[PDB]
């Protein structure tokens, strides 16, 4: 397989100026006629004309309307069409082709495919070449004129990019629409949709130009009543880009379309965003709370690409983080402003430090701008997206809001409807940095290391306080562990937002301060510090690093109680838990290894338990934040701190810590579960489709977390509460009633009740499947088998497959069963899925990412399943490449 290197970028010897498509959809085949108006570029050296073209069946090809003949004048190997240079004109010419494709049997969901009764395209990154021949790379900018025809009764709604310029009838009960999109775009932003779609619409008037924009949200008829929140999210997105960035939408119309079968969450095709239904459709009756934030996130995110990705484009796929990390960052700012809850930021940090930190210490570790790739899996990653987002957010932290906005607007104005690279972004930020520091000497050259260096930096602290001098010192060190990408890691530009808390009264002792650490170590001294402070370090999580605060648990407790920054409070709690987990883990591990007949465990710090109770019982404290403090750190976060992690031992450690705290706090939890009911489950706005209260949803999160704690504990009579909860109108509640009932004889009664409530809404059924999969059941393997036989069957819908299996992979005790049966089961699913959808098969590999972090027995079991998969004669390029990289072959 071909390895592509970043440094080898060279412009094509061809230009494609105009694409004119005719897409004729029939029952058994789709006919795609394409005329490319092309030219020879200044880089041309009289090479062969080579088009990408995957799985296309050629009816004809022609140059200047002269039919070309196979073998003589072109060859085609199902991947590349080669037109021998002697037949390629030397000035402007027309290339035309007619190919046949088969969206009905395209279960890989890339290129043109059928999702239920909707025909839909997915072209990012390399899917356009599965529709027609092209030079399928994002620097080939062209104009598009697209005509789609189809059976009118089956496909009454025809959509593509641009303006609909004509609609016409065709003999045989068919009809057509022509869409012309004169602005240049890369082919990965082409889309087409045909179906019996229903819609909601609104008109948005832009802030400055006062342009009327038509907004249409589409879905199949069955679910059209689930579109209202998306439309509200879209309006919000557009207002935020105006308000924060001063950016308005440029086009007459924006369509959002929900489809049932989709490899990812959504896709920003220009004017025609296409979504996984699970990231567009929601109702209060038929969705869990999580859907509301998800739809807000995904509508926002694809909307923000209209600038960062669609108007300012990528020259090549190595710059992916410049559209994805920057767009994630824009959506984070949006969501933070929309939700007004601290849990928006904390949830993103929680993901980065579990999932992305895991990736960055795995054999898959890469910088946010990789130097090479064989498959797009090397790009579409939590590193590129989420660490990329934190790299983009660090500019805002360094510059502050006014100068960040100034630098952002420099980038937009300079690069609007060109291609840009990460260096172009850094440049624009640097111009702002100069303006802010007040000198053209200052630069951000060191900052560029965040794009090229892999691995997570470790930042550690020592302190000094001189009481006589009133002088306080923070000594900071950074280190990044060498890996496969850099043998010698350089110091990064790390911005460290800090506060100093007076431990006597909880007050801030200094103004807003961001320490700029640019060397391997530095000492920051503060004068006129009246009392020894407790430092509040990396406020807001100000750089994507392992923070080693070297604080005592008494200092962390004081921050947890009294600090002003939510992340630091959360982090201090996290750190207290980690110190406890590592200690108890080692005590259990020693008892297992030494086969001890008796041993001691270090109990949970009582003052920490007291602090949790203090916060829980504070009626002015935030319910979302409360839910994080009563939860231990994610397993995938904890794994970053333990070599040869024995999962069973970790499961015993967690059990012990949870039981220690519950033994003190269960009455508090019960009281709160009851006192929260009225506001959490308030039905006042249940039938107001547009009324979304993120604080109220966080109250339900807290109740549902507490209920789980109480049910695991077999708190007296909790089953009564569980059964009553099953009767709630909110799916978050009644599906929670299912999961927490796992600990009781009522589980299967609730399984049936909740199945019946879920079964007639495709997405709700998927949420039910997740709830069953995640259930803490001793007979979980038998339950999956029942899901497989009765519900999932041979569904190829990636939402169904992911729902049945992924939540189960997080079951620490059972997925990691020492027989290896869990690893076996998931490898079987990956291999089955790989036959028709290599992308989703590769997604299903996720639990294997930490394989080399586990105890040696499990390392061996996982490695055995990965090698079994690798040996499959029919393995896809995508899966093979992924597993080869993961297993360090
Ligand atoms: C909210 C947001 C983070 C949601 C998120 N959306 C996005 O990633 C969009 O903007 C992307 N352009 C859409 C996209 C994502 C992945 C992708 O694979 C190409 C590929 C091919 C082979 C192997 C791995 C990956 C193509 C498009 C979401 O879909 O989950
Ligand atoms: Mg289905
Ligand atoms: Zn994106």
Short mmCIF file of C-alpha atoms in Angstrom, two decimals, residues 15 42 48 50 56 63 98 150 180 216 380 434 454 466 539 582 585 591 603 631 662 685 726 757 765 831 833 836:
data_model
loop_
_atom_site.label_atom_id
_atom_site.label_comp_id
_atom_site.label_asym_id
_atom_site.label_seq_id
_atom_site.Cartn_x
_atom_site.Cartn_y
_atom_site.Cartn_z
CA UNK A 15 -6.70 21.73 -13.79
CA UNK A 42 2.07 25.14 -15.18
CA UNK A 48 -0.20 10.49 -18.19
CA UNK A 50 -4.62 9.68 -14.20
CA UNK A 56 -16.74 2.26 -11.42
CA UNK A 63 -11.77 13.33 -24.83
CA UNK A 98 -20.40 7.49 -18.38
CA UNK A 150 -35.12 9.72 -10.51
CA UNK A 180 -25.65 25.01 -10.43
CA UNK A 216 -34.54 23.55 5.52
CA UNK A 380 -9.61 11.23 11.49
CA UNK A 434 2.85 40.93 17.96
CA UNK A 454 3.34 13.73 19.30
CA UNK A 466 9.02 32.98 52.07
CA UNK A 539 -7.52 26.89 35.08
CA UNK A 582 -3.31 3.85 42.75
CA UNK A 585 -4.92 -0.94 43.36
CA UNK A 591 -2.85 -9.44 47.89
CA UNK A 603 -9.53 3.78 53.55
CA UNK A 631 -18.02 9.65 39.91
CA UNK A 662 -21.45 5.18 49.85
CA UNK A 685 -42.25 22.38 28.93
CA UNK A 726 -39.42 3.45 35.08
CA UNK A 757 -41.42 1.81 24.83
CA UNK A 765 -34.43 1.55 19.98
CA UNK A 831 -14.35 -9.27 11.01
CA UNK A 833 -18.50 -5.86 9.72
CA UNK A 836 -19.19 -4.63 4.04
#
